[PDB]
Design a protein around this ligand. Structure first.
Ligand SMILES: [Zn+2]
Ligand SMILES: [Zn+2]
Ligand SMILES: [Zn+2]
Length: 245
């Protein structure tokens, strides 16, 4: 997602934390002046942008391209050296839960968990390796040149013309998604990546033309918005497992 998608995932999650995970999240956030679950949600993208070390080391952690293998994940093939979102989210979930670590270490792991639960629910972050998750599929959206990756990260969300305070209750108005009956932080990432991959491969998500507009938005923006709600609810369920147990 773009920044707004990441914030909205965190805002949906923040309201669903159990009292224990509430207190532990607040304790870790207070070690960074003015940090909220929403405000840190885009951080992993700004790091990858600007940081010559962790930014370069974590750039592959935002995605996993499994569409050519029909959305069947294999860690050795699709996540060499743990360099994809499935293994990165598993490892950062373990680090975040490790109460023997410093507040600094666990807050950084929280920033990755908040961001990556967002990104693992963005269909184009689990798509084709060969076109870089739709980045190479250039297309005209209304009168504006963009690409299929950007369309799903922010282009369709931007058409609502809502700030976070307007967009949040819209997402909360949806019927509740069915989650796993129990969080398994080591197994659920593969499930989520595969599900996001299957959406990238659904009929029409890759359009038959390179000029699209209102028809595409009206069909697929509701799916993007369902994915933000699902991501937010899965993030709360994970944080309640890792920090609220
Ligand atoms: Zn993102
Ligand atoms: Zn993206
Ligand atoms: Zn990202």
């Amino acid at each position: 997602w773009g920044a707004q998608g990441h914030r909205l995932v965190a805002e949906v999650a923040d309201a669903r934390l159990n009292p224990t995970a509430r207190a532990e999240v607040d304790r870790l956030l207070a070690t960074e002046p003015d940090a909220t679950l929403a405000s840190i949600a885009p951080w992993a993208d700004q790091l990858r942008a600007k940081d010559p070390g962790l930014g370069r080391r974590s750039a592959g952690w935002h995605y996993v391209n499994i569409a050519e293998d029909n959305c069947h994940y294999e860690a050795p093939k699709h996540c060499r050296n743990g360099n994809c979102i499935v293994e990165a989210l598993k490892a950062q979930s373990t680090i975040l839960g490790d109460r023997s670590l410093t507040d600094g270490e666990r807050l950084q792991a929280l920033k990755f968990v908040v961001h990556l639960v967002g990104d693992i629910h963005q269909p184009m972050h689990a798509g084709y390796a060969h076109d870089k998750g739709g980045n190479d599929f250039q297309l005209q959206f209304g009168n504006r040149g963009t690409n299929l990756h950007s369309l799903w990260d922010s282009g369709m969300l931007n058409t609502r013309k809502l700030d976070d305070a307007g967009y949040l209750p819209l997402l909360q108005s949806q019927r509740a998604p069915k989650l796993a009956r129990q969080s398994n932080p080591q197994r659920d990432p593969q499930t989520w990546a595969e599900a996001s991959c299957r959406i990238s491969m659904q009929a029409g998500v890759y359009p038959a033309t390179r000029k699209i507009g209102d028809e595409y938005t009206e069909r697929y923006r509701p799916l993007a918005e369902a994915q933000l709600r699902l991501a937010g609810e899965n993030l709360a369920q994970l944080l309640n497992r890792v920090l609220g147990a």
